[PDB]
Amino acid sequence: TDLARHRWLTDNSWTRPTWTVAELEAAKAGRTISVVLPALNEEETVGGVVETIRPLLGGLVDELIVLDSGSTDDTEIRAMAAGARVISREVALPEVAPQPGKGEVLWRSLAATTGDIIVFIDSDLIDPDPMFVPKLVGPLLLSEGVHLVKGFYRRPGGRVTELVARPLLAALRPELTCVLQPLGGEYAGTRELLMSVPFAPGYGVEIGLLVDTYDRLGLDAIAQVNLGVRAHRNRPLTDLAAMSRQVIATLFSRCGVPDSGVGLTSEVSLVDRPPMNTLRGKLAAALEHHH
Amino acid sequence: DLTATDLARHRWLTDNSWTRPTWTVAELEAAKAGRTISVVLPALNEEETVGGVVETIRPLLGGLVDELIVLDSGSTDDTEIRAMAAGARVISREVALPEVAPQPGKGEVLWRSLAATTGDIIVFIDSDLIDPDPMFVPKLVGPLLLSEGVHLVKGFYRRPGRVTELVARPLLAALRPELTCVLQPLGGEYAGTRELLMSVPFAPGYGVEIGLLVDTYDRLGLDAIAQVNLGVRAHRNRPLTDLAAMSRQVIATLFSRCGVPDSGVGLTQFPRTSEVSLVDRPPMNTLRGKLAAALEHHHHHH
Ligand SMILES: O=c1ccn([C@@H]2O[C@H](COP(=O)(O)O)[C@@H](O)[C@H]2O)c(=O)[nH]1
Ligand SMILES: O=c1ccn([C@@H]2O[C@H](COP(=O)(O)O)[C@@H](O)[C@H]2O)c(=O)[nH]1
Ligand SMILES: [Cl-]
Ligand SMILES: [Mg+2]
Ligand SMILES: [Mg+2]
Ligand SMILES: [Mg+2]
Ligand SMILES: [Mg+2]
């Protein structure tokens, strides 16, 4: 089974993406690219992240959007000043009452974008690099059959990643242990995939998308690329335990394990949002390729 | 609003948890009432600390404690002779249970200790402890000697670990949420009755502690489980690869008890993946003390 993981890494993993912006533009072939940054109270970093993507707008990148998650700091004005269009959760999907968590934000962004490719980038990154978006879309534009690209960082994984996500995947979806950073916030997906799957709530959205992509489209539909060396950032153990609890709930929900829904003495939801093509059928159909 | 888990936890802490388990050794001896107490130290290459742990338990020998055994797990250092000089009885896995070939891991050692001990109550203490305290054993056996219906006591430390808070407790919250009341379910210092420990299977390696906890709960509920404060101890740092291997086996063992299939695929390292290939051992009363008084489980019918 290590031969399967080995062949995936040789074909679907890039430690040193060579691609230039110019060759990626030339390869778009009519497809459009939307970059979405979710943001809840990220005034200190959102501008910096937007600034590294902004020079691509009008070229490789067709839309640059910050999806504000109900911030009360200066996130929106700083994201605007850095050159992003700022869209609230309510504007993205007005007739559906919002609910908390990151998964909600990413899901609503599908109704407020037009890209055939959607790129997600966390807005709390303190060291964003301008080649993030090019490296994330490279496999989608130049490799047949890829629908989800996960950006990983070399270390100079994470405690939740190595103690929770990777060992649970070994137990329940063993082929997926080849994904280095399954919980990473930087990744890109096709409209065809993202429009057609449920979105898990809160901190479960990344692992839910990975497992749903694996089941529906297969291992070769997933790729991964190295975005650069980044050290781990400190997070309190209570936040990490809360994130673990929701990663567990979403994995269990995708495998049919009855999860009690009981949190840690912490929020945990077992309810997905439905595929966006059920609420935006005409948008979704308009975005389906003729062939 | 308080949940059903919150309510059970609060009352369980009132009745079954002791932050200051101040029983005297004399009153615990007086309460033994013919029952005997075996203390078991599993040991795999702990030459630097095993003697110090034994030294703290030794003054109880002949009174509260009836036997003190280091069950050696195949050490190649000076673990055994240092345990001997410190005043313990050293028994190998092989001598403990000659008719079964050993397999590696901590669970095997504790399971085998049941055949090598005679106490009505068996106490487990890790042999790698840096700062063992002489009141560990009194505090662990208190609720077994004085509290009706208690069969398993988990000792915890106040802090001045990642697998417990990121793996064990979140998974218990999902699969057995009442058990999230236990502060340190993976702790190595704990005690149980012979009638309980002989009746349950033992999980291998790093899964033995969590397996005993869930097996006890599934048979007897929260009422049979207690916990006691052993004192203040700082977290000792372990390599990340060790923690990941521990996590993988805790997951395996929890899954087998809660009706979740498990791939048997160990952990992938970078491109190489191991195979969880160690088996649960059956209840020791299938090999020893076969006609002993069985453990009455909770009836699920009426
Ligand atoms: O409810 C939420 C949680 C996080 N987020 C954003 O998602 C990103 C990841 O959040 P995190 O670092 O707390 O895990 C970060 O950019 C947050 O600002 C939201 O937009 N809404
Ligand atoms: O195979 C094993 C593993 C650990 N042990 C002992 O169990 C205790 C807990 O081990 P640990 O801290 O490596 O998880 C410690 O005292 C070890 O010496 C064994 O006796 N056998
Ligand atoms: Cl721990
Ligand atoms: Mg933040
Ligand atoms: Mg973050
Ligand atoms: Mg050791
Ligand atoms: Mg230890």
Can you tell me the distance from the alpha carbon of B259 to that of B243, in angstroms, rounded to the nearest whole number? Answer: 24
- Domain CATH code at residue B252: 3.90.550.10
Question: Residues A133, B211: contact at Cβ < 8 Å?
Answer: no
Of ligand 1's atoms, which has the minimum distance to the CA of residue A203?
A: 14
Q: A36 φ, ψ to 5°? A: -120, 130
Residue given tokens 């109900």 in the structure block: A70
**Residue B117 falls within a domain, yes or no?**
yes
Can you tell me the distance from the alpha carbon of A20 to that of B264, in angstroms, rounded to the nearest whole number? Answer: 43
Can you tell me the distance from the alpha carbon of B174 to that of A267, in angstroms, rounded to the nearest whole number? Answer: 13
Which three-class secondary structure state does DSSP give residue B202? Answer: strand
Can you tell me the distance from the alpha carbon of A20 to that of A31, in angstroms, rounded to the nearest whole number? Answer: 17
**Residue B294 falls within a domain, yes or no?**
no
Q: B250 φ, ψ to 5°? A: -60, -45
Crossing angle between the packed helical segments B208-220 and B240-257, to the nearest 10 degrees = 30
Per-residue 3-state assignment (H helix, E strand, C coil) for B218-271:
HHHCHHHEEEEEEEECCCCCCCHHHHHHHHHHHHHHHHHHCCCCCCCEEEEECC
Test A262 with B174 for CB contact under 8 angstroms: yes
Distances (CA, A) of B65 to A108, A266, B69: 65, 43, 11
In chain B, which residue's Cα lies nearest the Cα of A238?
B165
Q: Kindly state the tokens that stand for B72.
A: 């050696």
Which residue range is the domain that position A282 belongs to? 1-287
Distances (CA, A) of A30 to A145, A190, B63: 17, 14, 85
Can you tell me the distance from the alpha carbon of B49 to that of B122, in angstroms, rounded to the nearest whole number? Answer: 21
Residues 6+ apart with CB under 8 A from A46: A37, A39, A66, A75, A78, A79, A82, A123, A124
The approach used to solve this structure was X-ray
Distances (CA, A) of B220 to A146, A287, B110, B228: 51, 58, 21, 19
Best of A155, A265, A268 to substitute, by most chain B Cβ atoms within 10 angstroms, is A265
Question: Residues A174, A162: contact at Cβ < 8 Å?
Answer: no
Can you tell me the distance from the alpha carbon of A245 to that of B31, in angstroms, rounded to the nearest whole number? Answer: 43
Chain A residues near any Cβ of chain B (below 8 Å): 1-2, 5-6, 9, 159-160, 162-164, 166-168, 170-172, 174, 177-178, 180, 237, 240-241, 244-245, 248-249, 252, 257, 259-260, 262-265, 268
Can you tell me the distance from the alpha carbon of B7 to that of B212, in angstroms, rounded to the nearest whole number? Answer: 24
Q: Measured in whole angstroms, how far is the alpha carbon of residue A94 from the centre of its chain? A: 22
Q: Kindly state the tokens that stand for B50.
A: 């095993």
Q: Which residues pair with B193 in a beta bridge?
A: B121
Task: Assess whether the C-beta atom of B93 lies below 6 angstroms from ligand 2.
Answer: no
In chain B, which residue's Cα lies nearest the Cα of A157?
B240
In chain A, which residue's Cα lies nearest the Cα of B167?
A164
Residues 6+ apart with CB under 8 A from B174: A245, A248, A249, A252, A257, A259, A260, A262
Taking alpha carbons only, the member of B96, B237, B100 closest to residue B161 is B237
Taking alpha carbons only, the member of A255, A192, A248, A195 closest to residue A221 is A192
Can you tell me the distance from the alpha carbon of B139 to that of B124, in angstroms, rounded to the nearest whole number? Answer: 12
What is the tally of structural domains in chain A? 1
**Residue B121 falls within a domain, yes or no?**
yes
Contact list, B175 vs chain A (CB under 8 Å): 257, 259-260
**What single string gives the DSSP state of each residue in chain A?**
-HHHHHHHHHHHEESS----HHHHHHT-TT--EEEEEEESS-TTTHHHHHHHHGGGBTTTBSEEEEEE-S--SSHHHHHHHTTPEEEEHHHHSTTS---SSHHHHHHHHGGG---SEEEE--S--SS--TTHHHHHHHHHHHSTT--EEEEEEE----HHIIIIIHHHHHHH-GGGGG-S-TT-S-EEEEHHHHTTS-B--GGGHHHHHHHHHHHHH-GGGEEEEEEEE-------HHHHHHHHHHHHHHHHHHHT---------------PBPPHHHH-HHHHHHHS---
Residues 6+ apart with CB under 8 A from A224: A12, A13, A14, A149, A150, A151, A152, A179, A180, A181
Taking alpha carbons only, the member of A216, A169, A196, A221 closest to residue A272 is A196
Closest residue by CA, ligand 1 atom 4: A102
**Residue B128 falls within a domain, yes or no?**
yes
Can you tell me the distance from the alpha carbon of B144 to that of B180, in angstroms, rounded to the nearest whole number? Answer: 21
At what resolution in Å was this solved?
Answer: 1.9
**What single string gives the DSSP state of each residue in A225-241?**
EEEEE-------HHHHH
**Residue B291 falls within a domain, yes or no?**
no
**A58 HSE (CA, 13 A, CB side):** 4
Give the other-Cβ count within 10 Å of A139's Cβ: 25
Best of A239, A260, A264, A270 to substitute, by most chain B Cβ atoms within 10 angstroms, is A260
Element at B79 (helix H, strand E): helix B79-86
Can you tell me the distance from the alpha carbon of A202 to that of A239, in angstroms, rounded to the nearest whole number? Answer: 12
Choose which residue among A40, A75, A244 to substitute to test ligand 1 binding: the one with the highest number of ligand atoms within 8 A of its C-beta.
A40
**Residue B301 falls within a domain, yes or no?**
no
Q: Kindly state the tokens that stand for B2.
A: 């308080």
Q: Kindly state the tokens that stand for B181.
A: 């009341």
**Residue B299 falls within a domain, yes or no?**
no
